[PDB]
GROMACS .gro file of C-alpha atoms in nm:
model
  307
    1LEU     CA    1   0.000   0.000   0.000
    2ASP     CA    2   0.095   0.374  -0.030
    3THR     CA    3   0.046   0.449   0.347
    4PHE     CA    4   0.215   0.733   0.547
    5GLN     CA    5   0.551   0.587   0.673
    6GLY     CA    6   0.613   0.822   0.971
    7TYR     CA    7   0.928   0.703   1.158
    8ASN     CA    8   0.765   0.430   1.383
    9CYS     CA    9   0.439   0.224   1.422
   10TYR     CA   10   0.272   0.502   1.635
   11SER     CA   11   0.370   0.807   1.417
   12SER     CA   12   0.280   0.603   1.099
   13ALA     CA   13  -0.079   0.542   1.230
   14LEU     CA   14  -0.120   0.909   1.347
   15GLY     CA   15   0.008   1.051   1.012
   16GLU     CA   16  -0.204   0.800   0.807
   17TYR     CA   17  -0.524   0.907   0.998
   18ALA     CA   18  -0.429   1.281   0.967
   19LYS     CA   19  -0.361   1.239   0.588
   20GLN     CA   20  -0.692   1.051   0.515
   21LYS     CA   21  -0.896   1.289   0.745
   22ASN     CA   22  -0.718   1.612   0.624
   23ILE     CA   23  -0.599   1.704   0.982
   24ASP     CA   24  -0.342   1.990   0.954
   25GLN     CA   25   0.013   2.005   1.110
   26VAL     CA   26   0.029   1.635   1.233
   27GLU     CA   27   0.217   1.503   0.921
   28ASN     CA   28   0.476   1.791   0.910
   29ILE     CA   29   0.539   1.765   1.293
   30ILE     CA   30   0.609   1.385   1.247
   31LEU     CA   31   0.825   1.434   0.928
   32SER     CA   32   1.036   1.707   1.106
   33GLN     CA   33   1.110   1.487   1.418
   34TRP     CA   34   1.484   1.441   1.499
   35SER     CA   35   1.547   1.205   1.796
   36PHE     CA   36   1.759   0.913   1.927
   37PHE     CA   37   1.717   0.712   2.254
   38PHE     CA   38   1.912   0.422   2.416
   39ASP     CA   39   1.807   0.225   2.731
   40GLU     CA   40   2.071  -0.031   2.850
   41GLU     CA   41   1.815  -0.191   3.094
   42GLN     CA   42   1.568  -0.250   2.801
   43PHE     CA   43   1.872  -0.392   2.605
   44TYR     CA   44   1.931  -0.678   2.860
   45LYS     CA   45   1.551  -0.751   2.883
   46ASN     CA   46   1.558  -0.780   2.495
   47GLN     CA   47   1.283  -0.510   2.479
   48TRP     CA   48   1.291  -0.231   2.210
   49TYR     CA   49   1.599  -0.046   2.349
   50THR     CA   50   1.705   0.213   2.079
   51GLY     CA   51   1.597   0.406   1.764
   52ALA     CA   52   1.405   0.737   1.719
   53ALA     CA   53   1.179   0.695   2.029
   54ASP     CA   54   1.059   0.463   2.312
   55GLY     CA   55   0.712   0.301   2.261
   56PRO     CA   56   0.461   0.176   2.195
   57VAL     CA   57   0.326   0.537   2.241
   58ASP     CA   58   0.580   0.811   2.143
   59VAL     CA   59   0.530   1.049   2.445
   60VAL     CA   60   0.792   1.298   2.302
   61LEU     CA   61   0.588   1.321   1.973
   62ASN     CA   62   0.267   1.375   2.185
   63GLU     CA   63   0.454   1.663   2.366
   64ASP     CA   64   0.556   1.808   2.020
   65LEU     CA   65   0.195   1.784   1.880
   66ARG     CA   66   0.063   1.958   2.200
   67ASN     CA   67   0.339   2.230   2.212
   68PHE     CA   68   0.344   2.317   1.834
   69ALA     CA   69  -0.019   2.257   1.715
   70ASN     CA   70  -0.212   2.230   2.052
   71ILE     CA   71  -0.309   1.875   1.929
   72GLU     CA   72  -0.392   1.612   2.200
   73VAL     CA   73  -0.387   1.232   2.134
   74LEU     CA   74  -0.654   1.098   2.380
   75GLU     CA   75  -0.617   0.730   2.494
   76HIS     CA   76  -0.959   0.550   2.512
   77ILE     CA   77  -0.950   0.222   2.715
   78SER     CA   78  -1.259  -0.005   2.666
   79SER     CA   79  -1.407  -0.347   2.763
   80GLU     CA   80  -1.504  -0.633   2.521
   81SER     CA   81  -1.871  -0.529   2.592
   82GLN     CA   82  -1.829  -0.173   2.446
   83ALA     CA   83  -1.503  -0.179   2.234
   84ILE     CA   84  -1.670  -0.295   1.904
   85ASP     CA   85  -1.989  -0.082   1.963
   86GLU     CA   86  -1.764   0.230   2.012
   87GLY     CA   87  -1.566   0.117   1.700
   88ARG     CA   88  -1.888   0.113   1.486
   89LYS     CA   89  -1.974   0.466   1.624
   90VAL     CA   90  -1.620   0.597   1.536
   91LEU     CA   91  -1.632   0.433   1.184
   92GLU     CA   92  -1.989   0.559   1.099
   93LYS     CA   93  -1.865   0.912   1.204
   94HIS     CA   94  -1.489   0.945   1.115
   95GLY     CA   95  -1.443   0.631   0.893
   96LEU     CA   96  -1.120   0.520   1.075
   97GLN     CA   97  -1.015   0.413   1.431
   98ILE     CA   98  -0.648   0.396   1.556
   99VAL     CA   99  -0.623   0.078   1.777
  100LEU     CA  100  -0.340  -0.081   1.985
  101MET     CA  101  -0.310  -0.448   1.870
  102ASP     CA  102  -0.092  -0.752   1.956
  103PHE     CA  103   0.136  -0.785   1.644
  104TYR     CA  104   0.134  -1.167   1.717
  105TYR     CA  105  -0.207  -1.177   1.532
  106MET     CA  106  -0.083  -0.942   1.248
  107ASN     CA  107   0.119  -1.086   0.950
  108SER     CA  108   0.240  -0.734   0.844
  109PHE     CA  109   0.605  -0.802   0.729
  110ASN     CA  110   0.727  -1.098   0.513
  111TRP     CA  111   1.067  -1.201   0.667
  112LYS     CA  112   1.111  -1.456   0.378
  113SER     CA  113   1.177  -1.142   0.158
  114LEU     CA  114   1.512  -1.124   0.354
  115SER     CA  115   1.564  -1.510   0.347
  116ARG     CA  116   1.449  -1.544   0.717
  117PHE     CA  117   1.210  -1.848   0.728
  118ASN     CA  118   1.219  -1.904   1.111
  119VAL     CA  119   0.955  -1.627   1.176
  120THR     CA  120   0.924  -1.626   1.563
  121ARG     CA  121   0.572  -1.510   1.675
  122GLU     CA  122   0.604  -1.241   1.953
  123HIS     CA  123   0.332  -1.075   2.172
  124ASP     CA  124   0.445  -0.712   2.092
  125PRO     CA  125   0.207  -0.409   2.088
  126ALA     CA  126   0.159  -0.234   1.747
  127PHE     CA  127  -0.082   0.027   1.592
  128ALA     CA  128  -0.337  -0.054   1.316
  129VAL     CA  129  -0.606   0.166   1.150
  130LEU     CA  130  -0.948  -0.013   1.164
  131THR     CA  131  -1.142   0.070   0.838
  132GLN     CA  132  -1.434  -0.186   0.838
  133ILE     CA  133  -1.627  -0.388   1.107
  134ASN     CA  134  -1.843  -0.676   0.964
  135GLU     CA  135  -2.027  -0.955   1.161
  136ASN     CA  136  -1.752  -1.225   1.174
  137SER     CA  137  -1.447  -1.022   1.044
  138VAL     CA  138  -1.270  -0.677   1.040
  139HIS     CA  139  -1.034  -0.501   0.790
  140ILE     CA  140  -0.721  -0.321   0.932
  141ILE     CA  141  -0.433  -0.122   0.768
  142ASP     CA  142  -0.077  -0.149   0.913
  143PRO     CA  143   0.052   0.182   0.767
  144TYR     CA  144   0.412   0.130   0.901
  145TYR     CA  145   0.453  -0.201   0.702
  146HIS     CA  146   0.216  -0.080   0.418
  147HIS     CA  147   0.006  -0.399   0.474
  148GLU     CA  148  -0.375  -0.454   0.494
  149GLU     CA  149  -0.534  -0.778   0.628
  150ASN     CA  150  -0.883  -0.918   0.712
  151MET     CA  151  -0.909  -1.067   1.066
  152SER     CA  152  -1.185  -1.287   1.223
  153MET     CA  153  -1.382  -1.089   1.492
  154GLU     CA  154  -1.253  -1.357   1.740
  155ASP     CA  155  -0.881  -1.288   1.652
  156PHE     CA  156  -0.936  -0.903   1.647
  157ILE     CA  157  -1.078  -0.922   2.008
  158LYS     CA  158  -0.789  -1.155   2.122
  159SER     CA  159  -0.530  -0.909   1.970
  160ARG     CA  160  -0.697  -0.615   2.159
  161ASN     CA  161  -0.719  -0.788   2.507
  162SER     CA  162  -0.379  -0.971   2.481
  163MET     CA  163  -0.093  -0.969   2.740
  164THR     CA  164   0.226  -0.850   2.555
  165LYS     CA  165   0.599  -0.806   2.644
  166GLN     CA  166   0.512  -0.434   2.714
  167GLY     CA  167   0.190  -0.505   2.919
  168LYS     CA  168  -0.180  -0.598   2.866
  169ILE     CA  169  -0.378  -0.428   2.581
  170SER     CA  170  -0.736  -0.333   2.696
  171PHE     CA  171  -0.903  -0.236   2.360
  172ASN     CA  172  -0.691   0.088   2.363
  173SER     CA  173  -0.781   0.337   2.082
  174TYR     CA  174  -0.627   0.683   2.009
  175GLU     CA  175  -0.826   0.997   1.907
  176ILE     CA  176  -0.645   1.297   1.743
  177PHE     CA  177  -0.825   1.590   1.921
  178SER     CA  178  -0.780   1.973   1.899
  179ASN     CA  179  -0.979   2.249   2.080
  180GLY     CA  180  -0.793   2.542   1.912
  181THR     CA  181  -0.497   2.441   1.683
  182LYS     CA  182  -0.181   2.646   1.597
  183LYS     CA  183   0.035   2.665   1.276
  184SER     CA  184   0.417   2.604   1.274
  185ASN     CA  185   0.653   2.675   0.977
  186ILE     CA  186   0.878   2.373   0.886
  187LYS     CA  187   1.197   2.579   0.973
  188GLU     CA  188   1.059   2.645   1.330
  189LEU     CA  189   0.981   2.269   1.381
  190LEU     CA  190   1.335   2.163   1.263
  191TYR     CA  191   1.507   2.450   1.459
  192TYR     CA  192   1.344   2.329   1.789
  193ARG     CA  193   1.413   1.954   1.717
  194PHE     CA  194   1.787   2.007   1.633
  195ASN     CA  195   1.833   2.249   1.931
  196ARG     CA  196   1.670   1.982   2.161
  197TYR     CA  197   1.884   1.703   1.996
  198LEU     CA  198   2.212   1.886   2.089
  199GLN     CA  199   2.090   2.020   2.432
  200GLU     CA  200   1.987   1.663   2.544
  201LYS     CA  201   2.308   1.520   2.378
  202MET     CA  202   2.102   1.253   2.187
  203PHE     CA  203   2.421   1.191   1.975
  204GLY     CA  204   2.572   1.077   2.312
  205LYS     CA  205   2.309   0.794   2.324
  206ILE     CA  206   2.443   0.670   1.981
  207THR     CA  207   2.794   0.656   2.144
  208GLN     CA  208   2.646   0.462   2.445
  209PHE     CA  209   2.469   0.214   2.205
  210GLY     CA  210   2.807   0.161   2.026
  211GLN     CA  211   2.988   0.105   2.363
  212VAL     CA  212   2.730  -0.165   2.470
  213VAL     CA  213   2.761  -0.338   2.122
  214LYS     CA  214   3.145  -0.353   2.177
  215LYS     CA  215   3.081  -0.548   2.505
  216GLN     CA  216   2.866  -0.823   2.332
  217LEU     CA  217   3.185  -0.996   2.192
  218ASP     CA  218   3.125  -1.297   2.433
  219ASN     CA  219   2.737  -1.294   2.416
  220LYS     CA  220   2.610  -1.619   2.247
  221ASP     CA  221   2.251  -1.472   2.258
  222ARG     CA  222   2.246  -1.248   1.942
  223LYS     CA  223   1.872  -1.149   1.978
  224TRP     CA  224   1.991  -0.790   2.070
  225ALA     CA  225   2.122  -0.752   1.707
  226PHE     CA  226   1.778  -0.849   1.557
  227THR     CA  227   1.598  -0.609   1.802
  228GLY     CA  228   1.856  -0.337   1.710
  229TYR     CA  229   1.805  -0.395   1.331
  230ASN     CA  230   1.424  -0.341   1.372
  231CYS     CA  231   1.470  -0.045   1.619
  232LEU     CA  232   1.704   0.150   1.380
  233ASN     CA  233   1.456   0.149   1.083
  234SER     CA  234   1.303   0.451   1.273
  235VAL     CA  235   1.636   0.645   1.237
  236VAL     CA  236   1.663   0.559   0.860
  237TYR     CA  237   1.300   0.687   0.813
  238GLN     CA  238   1.382   1.017   0.999
  239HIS     CA  239   1.685   1.063   0.763
  240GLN     CA  240   1.470   0.989   0.449
  241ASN     CA  241   1.187   1.215   0.588
  242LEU     CA  242   1.436   1.510   0.628
  243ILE     CA  243   1.567   1.452   0.267
  244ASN     CA  244   1.199   1.455   0.146
  245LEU     CA  245   1.147   1.784   0.346
  246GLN     CA  246   1.468   1.932   0.187
  247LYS     CA  247   1.322   1.857  -0.166
  248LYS     CA  248   0.963   1.977  -0.090
  249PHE     CA  249   1.050   2.309   0.090
  250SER     CA  250   1.387   2.357  -0.100
  251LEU     CA  251   1.561   2.379   0.246
  252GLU     CA  252   1.932   2.453   0.317
  253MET     CA  253   2.087   2.124   0.450
  254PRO     CA  254   2.448   2.019   0.527
  255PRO     CA  255   2.573   1.819   0.224
  256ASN     CA  256   2.628   1.474   0.393
  257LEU     CA  257   2.260   1.389   0.484
  258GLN     CA  258   2.241   1.108   0.218
  259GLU     CA  259   2.585   0.983   0.344
  260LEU     CA  260   2.441   0.970   0.704
  261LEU     CA  261   2.131   0.773   0.579
  262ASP     CA  262   2.370   0.533   0.391
  263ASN     CA  263   2.581   0.489   0.714
  264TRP     CA  264   2.265   0.393   0.917
  265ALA     CA  265   2.156   0.152   0.634
  266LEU     CA  266   2.507  -0.010   0.650
  267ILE     CA  267   2.483  -0.041   1.037
  268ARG     CA  268   2.137  -0.211   0.999
  269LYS     CA  269   2.278  -0.450   0.730
  270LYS     CA  270   2.577  -0.552   0.955
  271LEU     CA  271   2.346  -0.603   1.261
  272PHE     CA  272   2.113  -0.836   1.056
  273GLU     CA  273   2.419  -1.023   0.911
  274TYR     CA  274   2.564  -1.056   1.269
  275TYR     CA  275   2.226  -1.190   1.405
  276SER     CA  276   2.184  -1.454   1.127
  277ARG     CA  277   2.536  -1.530   0.979
  278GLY     CA  278   2.721  -1.580   1.315
  279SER     CA  279   3.017  -1.342   1.237
  280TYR     CA  280   3.249  -1.205   1.516
  281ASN     CA  281   3.244  -0.835   1.406
  282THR     CA  282   3.089  -0.666   1.719
  283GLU     CA  283   3.402  -0.438   1.715
  284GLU     CA  284   3.333  -0.339   1.347
  285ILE     CA  285   2.959  -0.262   1.415
  286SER     CA  286   3.061  -0.075   1.740
  287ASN     CA  287   3.313   0.141   1.539
  288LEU     CA  288   3.051   0.227   1.267
  289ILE     CA  289   2.800   0.331   1.545
  290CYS     CA  290   3.057   0.545   1.739
  291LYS     CA  291   3.166   0.707   1.403
  292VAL     CA  292   2.803   0.796   1.298
  293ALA     CA  293   2.750   0.944   1.653
  294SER     CA  294   3.032   1.203   1.587
  295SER     CA  295   2.891   1.271   1.232
  296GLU     CA  296   2.531   1.317   1.370
  297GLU     CA  297   2.661   1.564   1.639
  298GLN     CA  298   2.840   1.772   1.365
  299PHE     CA  299   2.536   1.741   1.126
  300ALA     CA  300   2.294   1.872   1.399
  301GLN     CA  301   2.528   2.174   1.469
  302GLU     CA  302   2.563   2.245   1.090
  303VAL     CA  303   2.179   2.227   1.037
  304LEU     CA  304   2.129   2.513   1.295
  305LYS     CA  305   2.386   2.731   1.102
  306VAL     CA  306   2.239   2.684   0.746
  307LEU     CA  307   1.863   2.616   0.818
   0.00000   0.00000   0.00000
């Protein structure tokens, strides 16, 4: 499908809704995001430990939407008794509902496309856009993986009341609400993001990630490298989103943005090859990560000068 990518599952679903429903500011606020996080405690629990933002809900993006556009994302929790009824209300009014779903019941990405046939089923939370409720089935879009699927009403309910690695889903839905919006120019959005990036030393978290990778030289459990590969797609998307902004608004950018994207793509490739091919190149992957950290710090400083 040709769905709004965003930079993660949450921002994808928000931007897809906002695009289809013609809600102003949301898309540009998502596409202008510039962030990196690392959590060493999440690393050793093999939870989602790095990338653009923590999840499943991107609280920093919710703060940005509130601060820049006065847009609130309201969390609706429901019971099995009311969840579908409320769904039918939301569909017959707005046409779409953003739902939290157990990805275990969603076949969004084909791992066989990357020659990975041992497709481990995991109870992870993800965001879908509900488009149709029938008697014995529903239709949902996964805008992050550009996938649609039809799901039995039984499986849809299971996916929305499921215990996951990140806690129990309770028919959670997300409403994009605004009682008095505001307009932000794309330069203002980027200026704030890149100032915040440097002030919070988010480049420093790339260094920390690289240091922890270095120390996995004796770790027989390579699951961290698979988790990392998936986590870092969010950073690649942010890089591509900024290139797409540069084109659209004819912005002044430092000249090595494509080079930075290519570096992140190479890091992802080496992490996936390490996970699956059983190489002993944790030092190589560590050095690429620590190098891109320095380059991202310089890039962020240069953006503020030329923007």
